[PDB]
Amino acid sequence: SWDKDVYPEPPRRTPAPSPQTSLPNPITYLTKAFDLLVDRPVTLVREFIERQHAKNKYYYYHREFRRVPDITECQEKDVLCMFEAEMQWRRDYKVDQEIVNIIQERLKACQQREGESHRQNCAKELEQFTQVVKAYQDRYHDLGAHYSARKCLAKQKQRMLAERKAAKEA
């Protein structure tokens, strides 16, 4: 269905029913009615559709992009190299947006799953969210609507220069 490592879940722990009353549980009998009247006919329809799909099985693939030289390796104003480097940077930018979305979805699912214990039990998801947001912010934030690989590089070199100076003074 989906990669359990990319979208992890803990092992579910349900407690067995432990009635302390003589009254019948209306939920238990509604569950039987739902299984018989709703789930069973629904499952039959799907199984029929699944048979048709097996008769006609065909594939689609995930496009793989070869790495090309990046903007740091492009001569100034050499548009042919800048174009390939720029299109690559844009593709990675769209991928990093989705990486942050994956981490945000982990954080949101953990908070709902852990209930009232979420502040303690979701620490690791929160910490990972904090790190990827920091990395994403360093790469791309404040570039403006006309962002480009060139502006991304100019921002990185500014950060690197401040980091070198800070260590120099240290």
68 binds other proteins (CB under 8 A): no
Residue given tokens 């299984």 in the structure block: 35
Q: DSSP string spanning 59-125?
A: ------PPP---GGGSPTT-HHHHHHHHHHHHHHHHHHHHHHHHHHHHHHHHHHHTGGGHHHHTHHH
Q: Which position among 83, 97, 135, 159 is part of the footprint of other proteins (CB under 8 A)?
A: 83
Least CB distance from residue 83 to other proteins, whole Å?
6
Residue 63 has which token pair? 């496009």
Identify which range of 8-16, 83-91, 93-101, 111-119 contacts other proteins by CB under 8 A: 83-91
CA 139 to the chain's CA centroid: 18
49 binds other proteins (CB under 8 A): no
What amino acid is encoded at 158 in this protein?
Q
Identify which range of 47-55, 82-90, 131-139, 140-148 contacts other proteins by CB under 8 A: 82-90
Q: Which position among 33, 80, 166, 170 is part of the footprint of other proteins (CB under 8 A)?
A: 80
Q: Please give the residue ranges that form the binding site for other proteins (CB under 8 A).
A: 79-80, 83-84, 87
